[PDB]
Design a protein around this ligand. Structure first.
Ligand SMILES: Nc1ncnc2c1ncn2[C@@H]1O[C@H](COP(=O)(O)OP(=O)(O)NP(=O)(O)O)[C@@H](O)[C@H]1O
Ligand SMILES: Nc1ncnc2c1ncn2[C@@H]1O[C@H](COP(=O)(O)OP(=O)(O)NP(=O)(O)O)[C@@H](O)[C@H]1O
Ligand SMILES: [Ca+2]
Ligand SMILES: [Ca+2]
Lengths: 291, 293
């Protein structure tokens, strides 16, 4: 089985042929910005032309949310002119092969799951801690996507009812205390201002104020993991993203989790398949669906 | 298809034959307490004898957690001498029909799900707010039970990192803020003391302090529901239990939910299938499993 894999980001669109889990014929173009909706139809037509005849099926990872083949988001304004873009339908204009679509964090989850021991790990969660917090959830070896592609938005679960307000209005979500954006909202008000990377450097040098800020984030992620373990019987959590992978961060997450009662514990590890995670994860998931 | 359905509670064991969702041949006995483990083996022998020949399969609802056919609990204290009791193996000594096991809140979830429109509702959560807070979760029309029977323990998810400590050790759980026990922990300290039922009566008369206590619980349940909607794409939540069904309670829950952004909203209704929920839910679920493999 040969997969035409597409990874549609906010800035770049990567395409490739994936066969036996191997990438070949990479290609990267800019995500349409001018007249984006009209342009995207052209871009997709051109990609499907370039690889014509070379694929048995198409797998699309995209930022945002895939709702019944349509590209959307919690705030569809963050997509600009691609809000509500009919993604599956436009691809289907140019091919009769089956097309699967999922979002980018879901695809990254599948990239980190595909090489797990699936006898031993059937309930699995990928959390990216980056500019924001996103997730992908796999239960009984299957990724959650139904009915509307929302499952996995665990960055919008509650971290503290007295915490900061999150982007779209919920008071106290994980995103507003744990994400890189939430770290910077505090560190940029320091005299003088610091970025999250600078706050981390100070944390690793035992700066107590920087440490408190990084702990605020790590503690929120630890409590989210505990919620997933006790709520869903999750067995393993893989953490990625530039904050999630920062030196010292995951060890702090695990220290907070370990001081909870042992039945909140699970395997917690850093992401190790970030390279081409969207492409490889989408190809694996769509092939798995085909069974 | 004929189901021998058992509902093993803290104090009573109910049994019955369930055929096409109809109950017949009820028996109800006391849950063994003296020499519980030894006695339970006898009780199960006796029940399977009484019903011998009358069932194609066995469905068991039990309090606590079913881990690979064994009765356990987050803290095995509240199981007494039935802690780690080999429930499936013990029943299998007396029958070769198939035996399915699930916990009591999971069974109540299935009782409330079985008459939903399965086309329109595939992700469904049942929450019982009573002495404690329990849940049962159904995703893509299937109850979550693997691998170790823990799925659905949403009373132990976080409500407030500065809230009270939960019974089994976690700081700030939903249960320690929302359950009947948590309400009474505060209202028993009033001068003079009140039970939760009395606190609710005062809340309905607009006592601001009692109202504050009830809102603490309702807001915590509303935030849990919001977590389930955004985290799991849950479409419908059904709320039961003596606190959950108390007059005024669910409207308050829904009022808190409705002030959040629209994408946290879902259908929220009161439980309506509480009667024989254990028996009927277990019977339906085990049949559903058998149909699908
Ligand atoms: N080495 C680093 N250590 C800690 N935080 C970092 C580091 N690098 C970047 N960040 C922060 O992590 C967040 C995203 O970083 P970055 O990866 O550079 O942006 P991006 O990749 O374009 N967006 P995203 O898809 O979320 O990763 C921001 O809050 C950064 O300040
Ligand atoms: N009408 C009521 N309104 C509000 N709270 C109530 C009411 N009745 C009982 N409660 C409280 O809810 C909890 C359980 O009440 P009750 O149902 O009588 O015991 P139970 O049957 O053992 N419940 P449970 O074991 O949790 O399924 C206790 O906290 C009660 O104080
Ligand atoms: Ca929000
Ligand atoms: Ca606990």
């Amino acid at each position: 089985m040969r997969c035409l894999a597409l990874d549609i980001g906010g800035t770049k669109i990567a395409s490739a042929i994936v066969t036996d889990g191997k990438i070949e014929q990479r290609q990267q173009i800019a995500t349409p910005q001018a007249d984006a909706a009209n342009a995207m139809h052209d871009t997709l037509a051109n990609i499907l032309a370039l690889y014509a005849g070379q694929f048995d099926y198409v797998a699309v990872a995209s930022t945002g949310i895939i709702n019944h083949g349509v590209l959307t988001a919690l705030n569809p304004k963050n997509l600009g002119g691609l809000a509500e873009f009919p993604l599956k339908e436009s691809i289907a204009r140019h091919t009769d092969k089956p097309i699967g679509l999922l979002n980018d964090v879901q695809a990254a989850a599948c990239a980190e799951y595909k090489d797990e021991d699936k006898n031993a790990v059937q309930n699995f969660v990928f959390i990216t801690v980056s500019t924001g917090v996103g997730g992908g959830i796999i239960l009984e070896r299957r990724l959650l996507t139904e009915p509307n592609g929302v499952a996995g938005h665990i960055g919008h679960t509650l971290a503290d009812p007295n915490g900061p307000v999150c982007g779209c209005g919920r008071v106290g979500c994980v995103e507003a205390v744990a994400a890189g954006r939430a770290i910077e909202a505090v560190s940029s008000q320091w005299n003088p201002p610091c970025t999250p990377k600078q706050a981390f450097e100070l944390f690793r040098k035992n700066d107590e104020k920087a440490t408190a800020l990084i702990q605020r984030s790590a503690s929120a992620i630890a409590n989210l993991i505990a919620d997933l373990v006790i709520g869903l019987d999750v067995q393993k959590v893989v953490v990625g993203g530039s904050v999630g992978l920062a030196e010292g961060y995951l060890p702090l997450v695990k220290q907070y989790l370990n001081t909870m009662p042992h039945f909140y514990h699970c395997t917690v590890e850093q992401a190790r398949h970030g390279q081409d995670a969207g492409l490889l994860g989408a190809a694996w998931w769509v092939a798995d669906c085909l069974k």
